Structure formats: structure tokens, C-alpha cells
Amino acid sequence: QPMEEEEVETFAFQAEIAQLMSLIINTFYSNKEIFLRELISNSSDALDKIRYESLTDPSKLDSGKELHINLIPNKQDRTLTIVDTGIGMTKADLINNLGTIAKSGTKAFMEALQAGADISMIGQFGVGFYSAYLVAEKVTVITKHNDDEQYAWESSAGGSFTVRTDTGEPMGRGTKVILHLKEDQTEYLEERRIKEIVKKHSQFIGYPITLFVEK
Numbered sequence: 001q002p003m004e005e006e007e008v009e010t011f012a013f014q015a016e017i018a019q020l021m022s023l024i025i026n027t028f029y030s031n032k033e034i035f036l037r038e039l040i041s042n043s044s045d046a047l048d049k050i051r052y053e054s055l056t057d058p059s060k061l062d063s064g065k066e067l068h069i070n071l072i073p074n075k076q077d078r079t080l081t082i083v084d085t086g087i088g089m090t091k092a093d094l095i096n097n098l099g100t101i102a103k104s105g106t107k108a109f110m111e112a113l114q115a116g117a118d119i120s121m122i123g124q125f126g127v128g129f130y131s132a133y134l135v136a137e138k139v140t141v142i143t144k145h146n147d148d149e150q151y152a153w154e155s156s157a158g159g160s161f162t163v164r165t166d167t168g169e170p171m172g173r174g175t176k177v178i179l180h181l182k183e184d185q186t187e188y189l190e191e192r193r194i195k196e197i198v199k200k201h202s203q204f205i206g207y208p209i210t211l212f213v214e215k
């Protein structure tokens with residue numbers, strides 16, 4: 001019962017990343033559904049990583065042999081969670097890859113959108129993760145890499161994100177991306193819609209994907 005103390009670190013998003021996030025949140029786009037494709041691709045890439053590292057060193061699957069993606073809608077807390085057993089991210093990975101370091105493509109993507117590009121283009125510009133903000137007012141990333149502890153990344157945009165040691169449910173190895181869906185984006189909690197968009201845009205993923213439906 002004694003009071004637990006948890007360390008938090010707050011970080012500023014690189015300037016253009018912040019500008020991109022604002023643009024994603026504040027402009028209307030049709031075709032927002034592609035966000036799911038982006039997150040499954042990231043999971044896919046992370047699963048490739050672990051599969052390859054494990055040929056080199058089999059003891060990298062100690063933290064779990066199965067390589068897969070799970071989708072978990074929750075109509076009670078209005079969240080959609082994408083879980084993989086890929087490589088995971090170290091603390092430095094989260095800080096460096098998800099927000100503090102400039103991406104080569106950001107500027108090109110913002111011009112391309114200002115010119116009328118379909119939001120679907122985001123993948124090609126190396127900034128696909130931020131498509132989460134088409135549908136989510138807040139995103140939490142839980143992650144565990146073999147070389148590090150479990151950490152939580154979180155941002156409601158607005159220019160900052162935080163990183164902290166995670167003291168929730170141990171994950172083993174991989175990444176859990178939790179989308180707190182905006183009020184008007186709850187269609188992404190529907191099993192038909194999720195099935196629909198996986199079939200359309202994510203049908204050549206090289207790992208099994210399971211959808212967990214409550215009831």
C-alpha cells in the first residue's frame with residue numbers, strides 16, 4: 001500500500017513534427033481509415049526485426065516465440081489497441097523515433113497535403129505513425145524491448161509527449177499502441193469496419209492478425 005514514486009520525462013516534439021501533428025488534427029481529411037494500415041505496417045516491420053535478430057541469436061525469443069498482431073476494440077473506454085510481439089522499443093528508441101528527431105520527409109509531406117494529396121500518402125514520407133491522430137485525441141504506446149524495461153509513451157499532441165517506466169501489465173516483448181478515439185471516430189470500434197479495413201489495406205501482412213471482440 002505505501003505510496004509509489006514514478007519518474008516522468010516530458011519532451012517537446014521536433015518543430016515540423018509538431019506542425020504536422022497540428023495539420024493532421026485540425027484539417028478535415030476523408031480516407032482516415034488508412035491509420036490502421038500504418039500501425040499494422042509498423043507492427044509488421046517490428047516483427048521482421050525480431051524474426052531476423054532471432055536467426056542470429058535464438059535467445060531473443062526467450063521473451064516469447066509467437067510473432068503476431070492483435071486488434072482489441074473496447075466500446076466501453078472508446079479505445080482501439082494494436083498489439084504486436086515484434087522487437088519493441090528501448091527508452092532511447094521511443095524518444096528518438098517517436099518525436100524528438102527531425103524526419104527527412106515531414107516538410108515534403110506538409111507541402112504535398114497543402115497541395116491536396118490524399119492523407120493516404122503519409123506512409124511514403126516516413127511519418128506514418130502520426131496518422132493515429134486522424135482518429136485518436138490521445139495515443140499511448142506501451143513497449144518492451146529485450147534490452148530494456150517496459151516504458152510508456154503518451155501524447156495528446158499540443159507539442160509535448162511524456163515517457164515513463166511502465167508499472168502496468170508486463171508485456172513480454174513488443175508494442176501496444178492504444179488509440180483513445182475521438183467522439184466522432186467510434187466506427188473504428190466496430191468489428192465489421194475493422195475487418196473491412198484490414199481486408200482493403202493490410203491483406204499482405206506476413207504475420208497472423210487476430211481481432212478480439214468483447215461479448
Ligand SMILES: [Mg+2]
Nearest residue numbers: 041042128129
Ligand atoms: Mg511506418
